[PDB]
Design a protein around this ligand. Sequence first.
Ligand code: SF4
Ligand code: SF4
Ligand code: FES
Ligand SMILES: [Br-]
Ligand SMILES: [Br-]
Ligand SMILES: [Br-]
Ligand SMILES: [Br-]
Ligand SMILES: [Br-]
Ligand SMILES: [Br-]
Ligand SMILES: [Br-]
Ligand SMILES: [Br-]
Ligand SMILES: [Br-]
Ligand SMILES: [Br-]
Ligand SMILES: [Br-]
Ligand SMILES: [Br-]
Ligand SMILES: [S]
Ligand SMILES: [Xe]
Ligand SMILES: [Xe]
Ligand SMILES: [Xe]
Ligand SMILES: [Xe]
Ligand SMILES: [Xe]
Ligand SMILES: [Xe]
Ligand SMILES: [Xe]
Ligand SMILES: [Xe]
Ligand SMILES: [Xe]
Ligand SMILES: [Xe]
Ligand SMILES: [Xe]
Ligand SMILES: [Xe]
Ligand SMILES: [Xe]
Ligand SMILES: [Xe]
Ligand SMILES: [Xe]
Ligand SMILES: [Xe]
Ligand SMILES: [Xe]
Ligand SMILES: [Xe]
Ligand SMILES: [Xe]
Ligand SMILES: [Xe]
Ligand SMILES: [Xe]
Ligand SMILES: [Xe]
Ligand SMILES: [Xe]
Ligand SMILES: [Xe]
Ligand SMILES: [Xe]
Ligand SMILES: [Xe]
Ligand SMILES: [Xe]
Ligand SMILES: [Xe]
Ligand SMILES: [Xe]
Ligand SMILES: [Xe]
Ligand SMILES: [Xe]
Ligand SMILES: [Xe]
Lengths: 629, 628
Amino acid sequence: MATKTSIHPSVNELYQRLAEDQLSNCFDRFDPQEKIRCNYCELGVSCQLCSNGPCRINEKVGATLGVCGINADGMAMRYMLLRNVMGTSTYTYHAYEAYKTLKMTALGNTPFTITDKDKLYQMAKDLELNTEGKPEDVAVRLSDFLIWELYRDYDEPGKMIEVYAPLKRKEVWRKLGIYPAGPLHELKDAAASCLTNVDGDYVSLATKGLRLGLSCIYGAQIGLELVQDILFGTGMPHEMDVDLGIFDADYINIVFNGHEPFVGVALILAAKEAVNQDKAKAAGAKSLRIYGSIESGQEVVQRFQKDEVFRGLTGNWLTIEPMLATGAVDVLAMDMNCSPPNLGPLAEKYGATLVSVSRLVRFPGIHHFLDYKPSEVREIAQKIIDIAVDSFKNKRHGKITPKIPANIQKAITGFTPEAILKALGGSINPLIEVIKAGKIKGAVGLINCTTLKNGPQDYVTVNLAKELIKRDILILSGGCGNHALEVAGLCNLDAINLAGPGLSEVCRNLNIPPVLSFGTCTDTGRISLVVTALANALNVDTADLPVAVTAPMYMEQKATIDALFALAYGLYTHVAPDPPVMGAPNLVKLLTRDLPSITGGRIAVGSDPVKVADDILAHINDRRAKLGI
Amino acid sequence: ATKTSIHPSVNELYQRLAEDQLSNCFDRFDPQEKIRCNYCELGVSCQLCSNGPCRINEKVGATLGVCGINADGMAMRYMLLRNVMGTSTYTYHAYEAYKTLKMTALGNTPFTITDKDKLYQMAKDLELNTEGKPEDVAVRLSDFLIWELYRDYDEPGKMIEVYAPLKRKEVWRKLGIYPAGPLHELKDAAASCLTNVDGDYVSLATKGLRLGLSCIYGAQIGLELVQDILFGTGMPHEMDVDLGIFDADYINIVFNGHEPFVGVALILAAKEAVNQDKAKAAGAKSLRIYGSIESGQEVVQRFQKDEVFRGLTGNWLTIEPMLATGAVDVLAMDMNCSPPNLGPLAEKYGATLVSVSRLVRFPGIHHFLDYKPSEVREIAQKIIDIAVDSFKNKRHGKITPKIPANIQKAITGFTPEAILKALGGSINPLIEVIKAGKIKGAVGLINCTTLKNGPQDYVTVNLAKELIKRDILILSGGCGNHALEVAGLCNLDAINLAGPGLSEVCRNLNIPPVLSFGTCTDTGRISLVVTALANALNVDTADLPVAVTAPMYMEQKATIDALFALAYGLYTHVAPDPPVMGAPNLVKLLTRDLPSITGGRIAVGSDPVKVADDILAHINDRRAKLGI
Ligand code: SF4
Ligand code: SF4
Ligand code: FES
Ligand SMILES: [Br-]
Ligand SMILES: [Br-]
Ligand SMILES: [Br-]
Ligand SMILES: [Br-]
Ligand SMILES: [Br-]
Ligand SMILES: [Br-]
Ligand SMILES: [Br-]
Ligand SMILES: [Br-]
Ligand SMILES: [Br-]
Ligand SMILES: [Br-]
Ligand SMILES: [Br-]
Ligand SMILES: [Br-]
Ligand SMILES: [S]
Ligand SMILES: [Xe]
Ligand SMILES: [Xe]
Ligand SMILES: [Xe]
Ligand SMILES: [Xe]
Ligand SMILES: [Xe]
Ligand SMILES: [Xe]
Ligand SMILES: [Xe]
Ligand SMILES: [Xe]
Ligand SMILES: [Xe]
Ligand SMILES: [Xe]
Ligand SMILES: [Xe]
Ligand SMILES: [Xe]
Ligand SMILES: [Xe]
Ligand SMILES: [Xe]
Ligand SMILES: [Xe]
Ligand SMILES: [Xe]
Ligand SMILES: [Xe]
Ligand SMILES: [Xe]
Ligand SMILES: [Xe]
Ligand SMILES: [Xe]
Ligand SMILES: [Xe]
Ligand SMILES: [Xe]
Ligand SMILES: [Xe]
Ligand SMILES: [Xe]
Ligand SMILES: [Xe]
Ligand SMILES: [Xe]
Ligand SMILES: [Xe]
Ligand SMILES: [Xe]
Ligand SMILES: [Xe]
Ligand SMILES: [Xe]
Ligand SMILES: [Xe]
Ligand SMILES: [Xe]
């Protein structure tokens, strides 16, 4: 049937049950779309932006330009920028709601508290805010300042990019003129440029894409992740259970799924109440348990420990459909991507109830809607707990047969730059010395999603991670590719012996895995804080560091914006499968050949793990040779 | 080319463009027709993630995309993502206008405060502080409107309470479509269109309605009122249109786009004697400034013709033939439409392309002058200088001019104040002429132009003729308004082409049967007319004998006004068909089920007679329900 499924045997076992129930799934839907693939759109030489279209680029038949007059390069780059507007919008949405959450928490209208006060005061100092009074007043000040960072216009200088970016990179950006405004104004200008007969210059549209990436990282991601640190704590390494074997059908299981962790931690807090556990027990279940899915669950497992209520991480987005096939989910609380639009019939067949906690998430089949609100989240949480208890009693218990796979995997989560400092001994210099000694050739930022385009689920990512660590290359993993690596067993101590000589030796001496789970794609900025550190200790530019960035199985634009950032950051950025720009030769030449003389980085292609690893190692060794190491 | 224009001048200049073996929109349309994608034409395509691209095809088994979305959600999501761009353009213009007003209040621009009466009346309607001198009040109004731009979800708006009718506001409350600021709304909509987020076409259509609402009451009304306060409220006056206004012996600077600040600065600087002496020293008779598309339309709404400013050239499909005249020296571009292939044409005909905005970029532009209110005085001068050299070294003596002879008269500058003055200071006379059957109803023709459903401006002009013959008044905005001005439907001569009652009313009031109200950005301005008639009757806007048509729409600045008209509860005609016709449930919601939700509905068709007949049938249905 489906030609490509997954590398995880649990996901395969559950896809087989999905297919046995004759329910549609992504794997089964891939091939019918393969039958009628459009090479125009796949090469990026098609457009749909105006009524004179739809236009295709075909010079051998006489259609050199669109009806407007744009060429293939401008077409591809403009479409890319247009959809990257969406990723910037998602990150800015997350950041704004995080700042609102911190503001409403500092004034006592949330079930949340200010956990990391050290980080709050350090941010207040570095951003030159007023530190007088209570910590909550400083939290309100930081909320307002980061909202202002969101709101910055084209003519107002920002402070986050001055604090969290190295000197030479800021020099490169100011000499390129790609110093961005606030992410709001930046995405506004990008979308306004993508309109018909506005911006049709592929160089200019790529410049605006780099501007949008910088806007996203320094105006949204860093601030939101540091505010989440202040709220729920800075992550420290701890052991965690992943893969779908963590499910138990005898419990009222609630799964939160999205990107923002507020609903999930509110559910954990409300489930710690004895009254709700007594409700779960009086309903006929053992107790009430909460599970974390994709990036929301990743955020939560970065900072929270495994107990009787919180049981771990389910997987990546391609695991959501088979997860419902377990027949063990009572509530799937959804706040952002991914919430696949055909989840209705699947939850109806397996006895699950779908609840959306966001005004962004809507699709056919949802049972309840509880738009997020910091002053309401507590109540929201409770309502979800009252929904599951009802669902469990009326739909799943004694009616749905569970099919929970046996695969449970150990994974070390919660790695942060502070955790790197702590494991090294408070200083980054030992990492410097093991990099200069040749034991660790370099570090790779694997900020990745997952997709069925360039192979089965997580094949490219996991096999490329193995190939990378085999060549003494450390990996900082974020995104759904990080979920893939945690499930595949590469994020625990047993994985030490899957690394090459130097990397395995150093990781055994430090008692850390060769793949450090830094969390989500939102942590890309956080990962930059590592590279910036490596750039500040050496007084060398980021483009000269033996570092690399890879998204071996990207899907939508939350990773394309991180790739555009890494390009503006001046890094070798591998992206697979091919973004739809290959029908534009000039843009391809700019992205893969010209940019190293503009920003410093370039775009790498390919889905072969061995060859991608070889090219990454070759770039790292070039950087080493020019560093004298 | 199988399709060109109904205007003789543009056909002649297309002939010259074809003589020079140069590419143009008319010629580029046909090669695209041989290989049209029916999928994208019907809106059953998607390119949002790497598991794609996907197409909806139930026969071969592709009922859903790899994500799981259906055709309805796919089409509506692509429509919402596209209209994000139009919302962004409107928000960009509004924010630049607010910054321009505030910087003018501090004495950093060549501008001033022309309409202080409107400044203070709007300050009082918004309950602002009237204290101090007009500069302070202007600063306060700018800050308030900027706050409107940044408004989020728990901050109720004040523009929508002041400028919207009662029953429409109650309907928007019970529907839950009361929008935030346009910035937050466009960001929320763009985030909803990401893969595996919002895949319900009903939710996406509700978000499109919210987007249009946040665009009209969060940007358009305020930006046009601010531009009025800066450059005076427009009043009806004579204007020359079509490309016959060009004279090759002068140094011609044409401002083209949407935002008119660069145009006003250019006019002001060109009126200076030193710049006219610079023009004369180059061998030219004098120095003239011309308006093009929507920026031109703003200026011609507010400015009369004189020795310097000459009027409007045409609409967007007239840009390439305009360069073909061989008379342009500088084409200053501030926004859309700026065709991305103007380089070779400007090289052939000796014109210099200048971009006065960081949004406009394409190969061949010779100078970039990103607009800043505190620099617009030095930009204009530079432009003028760039013209002088470009006159001496490129055009004068080498380029053969081919200026067409067609010139038309148009009465421009029709505003709600203009209607109120022409009616004697009250809305009751219009109520009487409508209730008596003289004017069956009014129609807002807010439109672009395109080659999709016919030659340039064919459907627009013919539909306007049929409407005015059916005793239906027309308020025209956008490039359709330019088409009507060039065709000669906005002067008194057009009264002979109106029906009996409409011609009687127009002869009594001395107005044309088509009122040139400005740009698509003036849709909200037109929304103030309907609202007024809704408040005098105490009826909802869905009960009024009004309608809205975009018979040759092109991009999303028109589709967002159509989404507003839908949320406004109006019969909204749009042609050609937007890419949704492959989504049966979405077409059902837009064309059939929306009357029970908002009151309005989408109408389709490019046959002028049938479209006018359906519009008149809707107006007569409303009339019968009103008892008139
Ligand atoms: S913007 Fe240009 S290329 Fe795109 S559909 Fe319109 S005419 Fe065709
Ligand atoms: S968003 Fe969905 S329908 Fe669109 S290309 Fe991706 S998988 Fe296909
Ligand atoms: S699917 Fe329409 S051009 Fe590719
Ligand atoms: Br094809
Ligand atoms: Br401090
Ligand atoms: Br402060
Ligand atoms: Br050409
Ligand atoms: Br086809
Ligand atoms: Br005074
Ligand atoms: Br003036
Ligand atoms: Br003079
Ligand atoms: Br300024
Ligand atoms: Br009025
Ligand atoms: Br009267
Ligand atoms: Br159709
Ligand atoms: S990602
Ligand atoms: Xe299904
Ligand atoms: Xe052909
Ligand atoms: Xe993309
Ligand atoms: Xe919020
Ligand atoms: Xe609370
Ligand atoms: Xe670039
Ligand atoms: Xe917490
Ligand atoms: Xe809130
Ligand atoms: Xe239920
Ligand atoms: Xe670090
Ligand atoms: Xe490390
Ligand atoms: Xe890295
Ligand atoms: Xe471990
Ligand atoms: Xe080590
Ligand atoms: Xe990075
Ligand atoms: Xe990219
Ligand atoms: Xe990336
Ligand atoms: Xe690329
Ligand atoms: Xe559209
Ligand atoms: Xe501005
Ligand atoms: Xe005010
Ligand atoms: Xe504001
Ligand atoms: Xe709707
Ligand atoms: Xe009128
Ligand atoms: Xe008046
Ligand atoms: Xe009326
Ligand atoms: Xe009207
Ligand atoms: Xe109207
Ligand atoms: Xe309107
Ligand atoms: Xe529309
Ligand atoms: Xe419209
Ligand atoms: Xe429609």
